[PDB]
Each structure stands twice: as structure tokens, then as C-alpha cells.
Paper text:
In this study rkbPAP was co-crystallized with sulfate, and diffraction data were collected at a resolution (2.4 Å) which is better than that for any previously determined plant PAP structure. The Fe(III) and Zn(II) in this structure are separated by an average distance of 3.1 Å, similar to that reported for the other rkbPAP structures. Spherical electron density is observed 2.1 Å from Fe(III) and 2.3 Å from Zn(II) and therefore in a bridging position. We therefore assign this density to that of a μ-hydroxo group, an interpretation in agreement with a previous study involving measurements of the magnetization of rkbPAP under catalytically relevant conditions. The Fe(III) is coordinated by a nitrogen atom from the side chain of His325, oxygen atoms from the side chains of the chromophoric Tyr167, Asp135, Asp164 (which bridges both metal ions), and the bridging hydroxide. Zn(II) is also pentacoordinate, ligated by the side-chain oxygen atoms of Asp164 and Asn201, the side-chain nitrogen atoms of His286 and His323 and the μ-hydroxide. Mechanistically, it is important to stress that the μ-hydroxide group is the only water molecule present in the active site, and given the location of this group the fitting of a sixth ligand to either metal is implausible. In contrast to the phosphate-bound rkbPAP structure, the sulfate ion in the active site does not coordinate directly to the metal ions. Instead it is positioned in the second coordination sphere, stabilized via an extensive hydrogen bond network involving His202, His295, His296 and the Zn(II) ligand Asn201. Thus, the rkbPAP-sulfate complex demonstrates, for the first time, how the pre-catalytic complex predicted from stopped-flow measurements may be formed and stabilized in the second coordination sphere of the enzyme.
Residue numbers in the entry:
A (entry chain B), B (entry chain A): 9 to 432
């Protein structure tokens, strides 16, 4: 039950070669860069981006690259990617795009410089899709009383691969649909299984093709060699994005990168350490049960050793919050294979209930395991609101409830600065 | 302990632009084709191969392709790959390489047509390397009273990545060193961790580059979209090669391929079902202990479901033989996490003790776990001798013993045709 192509939210902006499917993301490691992306259908157009700060009227111009691609019998429009760098912290900027022809204007606010007690509020959306439910979820996030300043996307964007030949037109519609948000505030991308799009039948064998062309990330900023895993620092948070569907065996590029990246985290500069991945390591629902075991046996010990605060995942179309637990004492024949409470371990949260194609995962493992703190099969999104270097407030909002109602509220105590039990 | 560059085995064949590092491998699914590979140092040369059988002296010519590559400050020679097809079963063929300049001649015997009771004896070599120990291992294989007709190589070829800048010259020496065998009988390649060669420091970020240029495989024959995993049928055996260091999460290329491939296995046509991978799923040695857990949680259930006979792995530089066990009843909180004997499960064998750079893994998990049937820290190789559709004899030969001494022998009873307890 996705929204029909004639839906108001898929409407195409008027004007000749008008920029469409506009979206932004952090373009550097510390937050003083932004990647501006958009598509033009009528003709190539300019890849220039004109921007200026609200205060200093000095208008500047940055040039970018343009690209195109074909999936099966599908031909893309003209995709533009431009990186604006050397921006100023905590300041509003205006940027215009589509200079040569029909011009459209947007704005964004750079984050404050990275610091120990710098407050910031992140949005959490996963497996959004483009169904009526998806629109409701996006609305609640926009109307949220505690305004979100950046969204952390945990995977499965458009779900265009459910249509015949993965009808890439559904990638375009999703681009216009989400523009109302991603054009004004950055979204941090995480690749999900619906982005793999491995279709040998139609001779499309390169994983993540549509996705990688449409969405760029500043992976090079963290010494990564691939766009499916990277980290960025923003305000008081250090965010690490992992790829559930890439190699992660010992010696592999992702494995090597993650190992070095954790050593580089400085809790004195960024107290909150967050990890994003599409498939959850802890999940008590029947759908995709134990799918995350493979990655868990490889990185769990590291998450505990470095005391990461929270791990966000999607994939399971529902909501779940775990107690701080670890299962790293197993040794094949020592029988220690039951998850135990660990104050050094992170809290795992499944938040992939933004809407997808309108289906909710209800069937859950019974009885509720001990490692599961709270769970519910309802659509919605979440908010991770950072206050101090010691306190962060997380909340989950349902689509049935009012915009300001928090069906689930939890205070997180930083594992590095305030290591006290924060169970609920 | 690596053999010095002046060692006799690394001798470069005389003659202008003489073909060197000649090696062959199966070129199709059933064995009526061969991929002939070689290198020329003085100049490109022809990529043609002239071949003929003992009977019909009819000489034919097949034209292949030539390619080169660079690593750091290393420049490869001219690499040639030619595929000879439509060969006749169980017949001896002669083939010449380097037609334009100085020609060299070799021979090989195609396997018999695939059948239910077709006998065939495979060799098992893993983590060969090029140390003095490596030369001994290869010698014992050549002198084996029961001559091997094809080698199943379980990973880690040259170990050139141990030298500064992975001195690719060490790939060339290894090519000349092993030529005395691989040029006369096929070797089935499996990629190991030393083939990854991920070296960002020197701007070499493409995994498996040196390896993939030098060693080609008939992966397309099995519908695979990558040379790191594929299968082949030879005599009464259906061999499946997996990549321990590639993506294998649900929905990924490898995962999808394996799932489909197992369905296509016909025990009525090829009774023996063998799987190759570099990292052992069961291992009681300290070195690399539990590294195979990630892939294990992914594919173990399938191996049992389809009753694969034997799984061969290397990586650990020693020898180990498990009993038929399985650890697939685990459900996170049900406590069933101990391996149990299973007559439907394969026997796991690790033979990565061919030599490498002269180091052997002697540290073992004490006491010996119940799932481990035999283990020993000695250099050697193995032989898998198929008799009928019901019986196959496996033997392990140490380098200290005589060429005909079997330090460990075991009869394998086919899991499909002769489902009886073959424990020792
Ligand atoms: C292939 C080549 O040009 N040889 C040189 C080698 O002699 C030198 O010691 C090394 C140092 O980095 O660089 C190159 O590999
Ligand atoms: C004498 C000799 O061996 N040189 C020939 C050269 O003349 C020719 O152009 C080339 C083409 O394959 O083959 C050899 O290199
Ligand atoms: C693309 O190809 C499919 C083939 O199944 C066809 O049904 C569809 O109409 C085509 N779309 C366009 C507009 O090319
Ligand atoms: C749109 O911009 C292109 C690129 O500079 C230019 O060639 C073309 O004349 C413009 N079209 C319009 C809106 O007139
Ligand atoms: C989506 O939500 C917006 C904001 O509430 C609304 O204006 C629009 O009509 C909705 N579109 C659909 C198709 O539900
Ligand atoms: C963090 O916030 C909490 C409540 O929002 C407050 O009680 C606490 O003192 C703050 N951290 C500090 C010590 O400044
Ligand atoms: C390698 O072994 C062969 C016998 O198979 C022998 O002729 C040769 O001398 C040996 N070379 C080295 C360097 O050990
Ligand atoms: C299998 O081989 C063994 C010894 O090689 C023999 O005893 C047995 O009878 C054979 N079975 C068949 C199918 O002939
Ligand atoms: Fe999803
Ligand atoms: Fe090895
Ligand atoms: Zn998913
Ligand atoms: Zn290895």
C-alpha cells in the first residue's frame, strides 16, 4: 500500500529543468562542510551551488560533478553532487541551486563546534519507504515539539526494489517525497538490505548501484575506502556507520577500518559514541531473528571494550529497546552463551518502524527475553536528545499518538562520564 | 625461512620471452575445458595455445587474452589467460605456449565424465607459501604412491604480502616454484586472507588485486558473479568454493548464490559434496580460534540440511579432523550451545599445514574438545581418494614421515548413499 504516483507529495516542482530530489548531508569529519545533491530531468544543467550566511551577505559559488546511470530499461536524470566546505559553525546558510535555469532556494544550519557539553538533538528513522504510514511518520518528526536538527537513517530507503525491475522511478518519487526535510537538515545514511539490489536476471550485478549514485557520503573524511561505512563527528557525538551487507571478516577493509576508528575516538572531545547499522545484533522478534549473529560474534566485544553508548538499527519493522547486555564469554564448549547484564555494554535499539510499504512486524518471540527492556509493534520514530556530557534523553513517538506524546522515554547515562545504572 | 631468490625452484626457464609461471585449472562446470595461464617477461607475445590429444594428432589453436597490472612501484609482466574447450573426457592432451618466440610444452589429462561411481583422487594443500618446508610438502605430493590428479587449494598462496610493499616479485617466484605441478594438473583455487592485500598506505585499496589478475577461475559456469566463490563438478564430486573474506550476509551476492547452488546439487549424478573455504568453522587451536564463528552461524545449518560430506579449510597452520557434529540448536536464550554429534553433518578438516613461511601453529585449546577427532602440529598435505559412491578414503601425510606413510587415515561413508557412522 504505497502512495500512488499522483500523490501530492510526489508532485514535481514547476519550472524548466527545476532542481528536484534535493538532499544534504555532512560533507566532512567535524561538521563544517555539506554535500548538496539534486536531480534535473530536462537537461544537464549547472552543478554550481550558490550559498551565503544569513549575516554575512557575501555570496559564494561552489562547483560540483554530475553523473547519470541506467538500471535495466531505466535511464536516470542528471544527478548533481557538490561539496560546500570551510563553513562557519552554528550559523544559518542559504543555498540556491539550478542557477542556469529555474532556480530554487533552501537553507540549513551548521552544527556548533564539537565539544564536551554541546547539546544536540538527533532524529532516528529507519525503513521509511513511501507508504501512507511513511508520510505520517515524517510529519510527526517535523511537528515534533523538540525540533530535530539531523536525522540518523538506519537503512532501507525507498523500497523501489519491490517493484518490477526495481522500477527506479520509485527512487525518484522517494527523492521528492523526502525533500521537504533532507533539503533543510542533514540525514546520515546507512545502507540497508533493500539497497543491495542485486538482480542477476536483469543483468544488474553491482551491489548498491542505484543507492550509491543517488546518495554520497563523506567516507573519505574518516580514512574509509568505501561509502558503506564511515564515521562523522557532530556536536558532542561521534557517529560510526557500519554496513551489515558488506564483508566484515578479519582482514577485510571494513573490519580493518572499524578497528582503527575505535582507537581514534576521544570521549573528552565527543562524549557520546553512537553506532549505526541496518541489521540489529539484539532482536526478540521472529522476523529476521538471529540474522545479526554473524556481525555480533565479530564486533560485540569491541563495542563493550570501547563502551559505546547506543547502537541503532532498523531492518525489523517495529520497535525494541534492550537492557545493557553482552554475550561475549562464549567459547564453544564452556556453556557460557546466555546474555548477561553488563554496565559496560551499549543499549541496542531497533527503530525500523518508520513505515516501509505499510507492513508492521507483530510476531515476536515469547516469552519476552530478559535482555529486552521494551518492545512494541507500532509505526513511529525516535529522538536522541543530548543535554550534557553525562545525560542524553531518548524517546519514541508512535503514529497513533499525538505529536508530543512519548510512548517510550529513557534517560541514557554516558558510559564514559556517568557510568551509573540507567535501567528502566 | 623462505627460500632465497637464487633457489633452484625459482629458476627462470631459458630462451627469449620463455613462458613462465605456467598453471592450469578447470575451465567449465563439467570438466571439458581448461584455463591455461602463463607469464612472459620480455615482451607481450601471443596468447595462443596449441593443443592436441595422444590419439587424434589433430593440432588446434585457441586464442586467449593478455593483461598487465601495477601494484606499488611494481610493474607486472604480460599475463595470459586462454580457455580451451570441447575437450574429450579422460584423454591425455599436449599443449604448447609461447608460439611466437621460444615455445614450451606441457600436458594434462582431462577427467572422466561425471558419474555415480567414478573414481578420482584429489590432493589437499593449504597455505603453501614458499619456504623450504613448502618445497618438501610439494615433493611428498608428487611422490605419493597413490597419485593425485587434481589439487584442492584451500587458501594463502604466496605470502608475498609479508614482504615490504607486498613485493609482488614474490608472486612471480611462487608462480615458477609451483609450475612443476600446476602446469600438469589442475588446482582449484580458494582465496585466503593473504590474498586480500588491502594496503591503503600504498594506495592499493582493491581487495584481491594481485591474486585476481594472476589466477582466473570458471566462476561464470556456475552462475556466480564473482571469482571468489563458485563451484565445479569433477568425476563423482561436486565442489563448492566459498570466500571467507567477502560479504556473506543475508541478501548479498555470495549468500544468494550459495543458497541456489545447494539446491542444484544432484547426489545421484555427483555423490560426493565437498566445500572449500579458507577459515575453518571448527577449530580447536588457539591461533584464529573462533574466527569462523561469523560464517558458521550463517551456513552451518545449510551444510547439514544438504548433508555435505567434507568441508576443507586452511588458515590455521596445522592439521585437525573433527567428528560429525553440529551446533545449530542455539536460540540465544535456550542454552543449547554445545556441539552435538550429528550423522547428517559434515566432517570438518583443516589442512593449512603445507608450509607457509616456515611457522607451524602448535598451541591448542586444552583439553582437546569432544568435537575434535584428531589434531597435530606438523607440516604435511592430504589426499581424498574416492572409490565408489559409498566409500572415499582420506589420508594425511606428514613431512617427517616417508612419502608413503599415512599418519592419519580415515574412511568416509557417503552421507547420501551410505549413511553409517564412520567415526574413528
Ligand atoms: C620495484 C622497485 O622499484 N624497487 C624499489 C626497491 O628497490 C626499494 O628498496 C623500495 C623501497 O620502497 O622501492 C621499490 O620497491
Ligand atoms: C624473433 C622473435 O622471437 N621475435 C618475434 C617478433 O619478431 C614478433 O613481432 C613477435 C610477435 O608475436 O614474436 C616474437 O617476439
Ligand atoms: C521496462 O521493461 C519492462 C519489461 O518487463 C516493461 O514492462 C516496462 O513497461 C518498461 N518500462 C519502460 C517505460 O521502459
Ligand atoms: C539552462 O542552462 C543551460 C546550461 O548553461 C543553458 O545552455 C540553457 O540555455 C539554459 N536554459 C534556459 C533556462 O534558457
Ligand atoms: C503527507 O503529509 C503532508 C503533511 O501532513 C500532507 O500535507 C499531505 O497531504 C500528505 N500526503 C499524503 C498522500 O498523505
Ligand atoms: C544534565 O541534565 C540533567 C537533567 O537534564 C541535569 O540534572 C544534570 O545536572 C546535567 N548535567 C550537568 C551535571 O550539568
Ligand atoms: C626442492 O625439492 C626438489 C625435489 O622435489 C629438489 O630437487 C630441490 O633441490 C629442492 N629445492 C630446494 C631449494 O629445497
Ligand atoms: C566401496 O569401496 C570399498 C573398498 O574400496 C568396497 O569394499 C565396497 O564394496 C565398495 N562399494 C561398492 C559400491 O562397490
Ligand atoms: Fe526494512
Ligand atoms: Fe595461512
Ligand atoms: Zn531491512
Ligand atoms: Zn590464513
Amino acid at each position: 500500500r504505497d502512495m500512488p504516483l499522483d500523490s501530492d507529495v510526489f508532485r514535481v516542482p514547476p519550472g524548466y529543468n527545476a532542481p528536484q530530489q534535493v538532499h544534504i548531508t555532512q560533507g566532512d569529519l567535524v561538521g563544517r562542510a555539506m554535500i548538496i545533491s539534486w536531480v534535473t530531468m530536462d537537461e544537464p544543467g549547472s552543478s554550481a551551488v550558490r550559498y551565503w550566511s544569513e549575516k554575512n551577505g557575501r555570496k559564494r559559488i561552489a562547483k560540483g560533478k554530475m553523473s547519470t546511470y541506467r538500471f535495466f530499461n531505466y535511464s536516470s536524470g542528471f544527478i548533481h553532487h557538490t561539496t560546500i566546505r570551510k563553513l562557519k559553525y552554528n550559523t544559518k546558510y542559504y543555498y540556491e541551486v539550478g542557477l542556469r535555469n529555474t532556480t530554487r532556494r533552501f537553507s540549513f544550519i551548521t552544527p556548533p563546534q564539537t565539544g564536551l557539553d554541546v547539546p544536540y538533538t538527533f532524529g532516528l528513522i529507519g525503513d521509511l519507504g513511501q507508504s501512507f504510514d511513511s508520510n505520517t511518520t515524517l510529519s510527526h518528526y517535523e511537528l515534533s515539539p523538540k525540533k530535530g536538527q539531523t536525522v540518523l537513517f538506519v537503512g532501507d530507503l525507498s523500497y523501489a526494489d519491490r517493484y518490477p525491475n526495481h522500477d527506479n522511478v520509485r527512487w525518484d518519487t522517494w527523492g521528492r517525497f523526502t525533500e521537504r526535510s533532507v533539503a533543510y537538515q542533514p540525514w546520515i545514511w546507512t545502507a540497508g538490505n533493500h539497497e543491495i539490489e542485486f538482480a542477476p536476471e536483469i543483468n544488474e550485478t553491482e551491489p548498491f548501484k542505484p543507492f550509491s549514485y543517488r546518495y554520497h557520503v563523506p567516507y573519505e573524511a574518516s580514512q574509509s575506502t568505501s561509502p558503506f561505512w564511515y564515521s562523522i563527528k557532530r556536536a558532542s557525538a561521534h557517529i560510526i556507520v557500519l554496513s551489515s551487507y558488506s564483508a566484515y571478516g578479519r582482514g577485510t577493509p571494513q573490519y580493518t577500518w572499524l578497528k582503527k576508528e575505535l582507537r581514534k575516538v576521544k570521549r573528552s572531545e565527543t562524549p557520546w559514541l553512537i553506532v549505526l547499522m541496518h541489521s540489529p545484533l539484539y532482536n526478540s522478534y521472529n522476523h529476521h531473528f538471529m540474522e545479526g549473529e554473524a556481525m555480533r560474534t565479530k564486533f560485540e566485544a569491541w563495542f563493550v571494550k570501547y563502551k559505546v553508548d547506543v547502537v541503532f538499527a532498523g531492518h525489523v519493522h517495529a520497535y525494541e529497546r534492550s537492557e545493557r547486555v553482552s554475550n561475549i564469554a562464549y567459547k564453544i564448549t564452556n556453556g557460557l552463551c546466555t546474555p548477561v547484564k553488563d554496565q559496560s555494554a551499549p543499549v541496542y535499539i531497533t527503530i525500523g518502524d518508520a513505515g516501509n510499504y505499510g507492513v508492521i512486524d507483530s510476531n515476536m518471540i515469547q516469552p519476552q527475553p530478559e535482555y529486552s527492556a521494551f518492545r512494541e509493534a507500532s509505526f513511529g520514530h525516535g529522538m536522541f536528545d543530548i543535554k550534557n556530557r553525562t545525560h542524553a534523553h531518548f524517546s519514541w513517538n508512535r503514529n497513533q499518538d499525538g505529536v508530543a506524546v512519548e510512548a517510550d522515554s529513557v534517560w541514557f547515562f554516558n558510559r564514559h562520564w556517568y557510568p551509573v545504572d540507567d535501567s528502566t
